[PDB]
Amino acid sequence: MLKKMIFNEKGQRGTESMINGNTTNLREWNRIKYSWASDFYRTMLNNFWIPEEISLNEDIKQFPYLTDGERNAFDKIISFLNFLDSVQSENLPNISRYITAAEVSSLLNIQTFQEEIHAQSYSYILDTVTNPITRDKIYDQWREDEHLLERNKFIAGIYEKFNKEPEIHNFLRAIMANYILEGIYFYSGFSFFYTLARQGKMTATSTIFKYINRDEVTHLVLFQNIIKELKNENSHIFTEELEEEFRQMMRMGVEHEIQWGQYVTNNEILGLNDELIERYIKYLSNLRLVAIGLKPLYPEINKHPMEWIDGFSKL
């Protein structure tokens, strides 16, 4: 696979295909192929927010009173989410460079900016509610927790395979990895912060995560639609065995997130337990797979186990 030119004077007008298309790379929003890119552009700019405009005065008073189990989950989760948002910052540009639909490149560039904002919001949280030494030991949790380090190497390793060897399948699994990250790893993290805010603790950082959650919904639909155009335009490489690979990347990611959520809560967070964490992640994976036309892994789990989250998460 080779990367685009900066400007291709031999390109044709408009957008021809998602990948491998003969494009100029010019931004011409009234000459686009995918209808849907126009309404995502609009929705994404209207969702703009600045983390520092959200006051944390009451969370400053509550942070010293979290139990040691609640602090244990907070530190390891917020450090992991900061890792996710930073590898997205670095890899999204990587993916956009082979995408030949300028209107899609534009949306990934908006997405990249939004990730930077997310990562910054964690710096704002940690620097405001605690002192510098505690802030730095939360940032460095991966240096002292063997389990967290190996999640980082695993997730970064999929993206890194395409960074060093740009082949179609590698690109293709890289796209799926993004999707899994967006729709599974982050939604687990959100439910922790909503469950503490539901009990009255750290209310304001939970507000910040509802803004992050709102952006994440657009990131999910962006990749959902990216996968389906790619299948529509390359149906010979979307074989029965390639689609099974995606299902299995997803199973493997489910398992990791479940094992991870149980490890940092350690039956010391009131309102979550190991069984509820298991059925929530599996249920979410059923929704994510059908949205891209794949059969669910857990056909027996059809009811939402934590229905209160969807009303709570909205602004």
Interface with a second copy (CB under 8 A): 3-7, 9, 13, 25-31, 41-42, 45-46, 48, 50, 52, 82-83, 85-87, 89-91, 93-94, 96-97, 102, 105-106, 109-110, 112-113, 116-117, 119-120, 122-124, 126-127, 132, 135-136, 139-140, 149, 152-153, 156, 159-160, 163
85 binds Fe ion (CB under 5 A): yes
In angstroms and rounded to an integer, the radius of gyration of the C-alpha atoms of the chain is 20
* Residues with Cβ within 8 Å of residue 60, at least 6 apart in sequence: 128, 129
CB of 134 to a second copy, least distance (A): 12
219 binds Fe ion (CB under 5 A): yes
Among 264, 243, 308, 227, which Cα is nearest to 77's? 264
Residue 166 DSSP class: -
Q: Which is nearer to a second copy, 103 or 278 (CB)?
A: 103
Cβ–Cβ under 8 Å, residues 118 and 50: no
CA pair distance 95, 274, nearest whole angstrom:
36
Helix axes 274-291, 186-198, angle to 10 degrees: 130
Other Cβ atoms less than 10 A from the Cβ of 282: the count is 20
Given 122, 159, 179, 211, the catalytic residue: 122
When CB distances are held under 5 to 8 angstroms depending on the partner's kind, the choice from Fe ion, a second copy, none that residue 219 binds is Fe ion
179 is catalytic: no
When CB distances are held under 5 to 8 angstroms depending on the partner's kind, the choice from Fe ion, a second copy, none that residue 149 binds is a second copy
CB of 77 to Fe ion, least distance (A): 14
Cβ–Cβ under 8 Å, residues 295 and 224: no
Which positions touch Fe ion (CB under 5 A)?
A: 85, 115, 118, 182, 219
